Symmetry: D2
Subunit: 115 residues, 4 copies
């Protein structure tokens, strides 16, 4: 995959399953255009968001609906969502894995960029 | 201080000094209205963003310009910025400390909410 | 304060209050010698562990009893404790702040070192 | 795998490759007995540490030699190593993935416990 997202739940020690997210690409007029979306699987992963041909250099935003996830467990969380905004290489295609670790009042994100 | 932000640098083991950030409040037309801005001090903290009277219920966004911070140190980081989006004061006035821990390819953010 | 520890609770969005910890120093026979202990305050901080004169060069271990903290809240956590092992003062005296962010199945620890 | 470890580098945005670690099991006299060891692969993963039959309930310690990893990149890090101490279910076998995210002055660990 050019772009994969993995989401983990630090309260339960498990993948974060059925988490919805949307991916946007910054349009030339500096507005966010829908690009891809999906929900995580039972492994907490979302694959198949895009293809190499389609995933060109640009500024992308991944918006993860963490609030609905916590509300489903009966927890009132702090964040409205988790956002990850990045430039996809200013030097050609590459493979991006975005990981997100969720708690009700905290999240961390990392990127793994391999070849 | 109804709203304080603290930023740490996980590469150097230091406060993140002179990091710019912008705070926005979601307006009635569902656009982001600029609310406050500033830079962190030598302790990595930004105080004095707002008062109890001005900090009403609403949805707020804190945008931390992490890319300029890393670029000044010679590092091309992954994220364009770190964003924190949250509802504030929906059960009455609270005090919010937002902490952010920065690395070039990862960040964590954590909120402490006191009454 | 040559050595201070701050502990936050990522589930509740609060300082982690009344968390016990034990500090050890590696002795000449390569065993751990008990150095200092205490509990965090209502601000989640533990001050006053040592003085500049007593805090000599060496290898130190901070053991934070996170399991008792979670169990008191009804949660069976993953870790037995959180441990931080580091060399201190090997380039001369420094001030160390150790921060720990706790969730039941995850923790993060971060050091700020100032001269 | 009953027990797998994955290590990521938050400075470079990559798997942490060739990181050495040792696993210990607490002996009945409260001493740490060597149990397994290995180095991470090019994917930052270490598989094949143990088998279901051998991995019985107990207290285990994973000691990750993060200091050698950073020194190989020319960085003087804070921690001597990263330690993860846990009880392997007080209610039978299960599958454990331990993830560790490394920076020079910070690390985070999480556990994913699936069935």
């Amino acid at each position: 995959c050019p772009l994969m997202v993995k989401v983990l739940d630090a309260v339960r020690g498990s993948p974060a399953i059925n988490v919805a997210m949307h991916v946007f690409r910054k349009a030339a007029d500096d507005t966010w255009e829908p690009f891809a979306s999906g929900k995580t699987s039972e492994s907490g992963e979302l694959h198949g968001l895009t293809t190499e041909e389609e995933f060109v250099e640009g500024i992308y935003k991944v918006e993860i609906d963490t609030k609905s996830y916590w509300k489903a467990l009966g927890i009132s969380p702090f964040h409205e969502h988790a956002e990850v905004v990045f430039t996809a290489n200013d030097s050609g295609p590459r493979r991006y894995t975005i990981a997100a670790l969720l708690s009700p009042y905290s999240y961390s994100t990392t990127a793994v960029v391999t070849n």
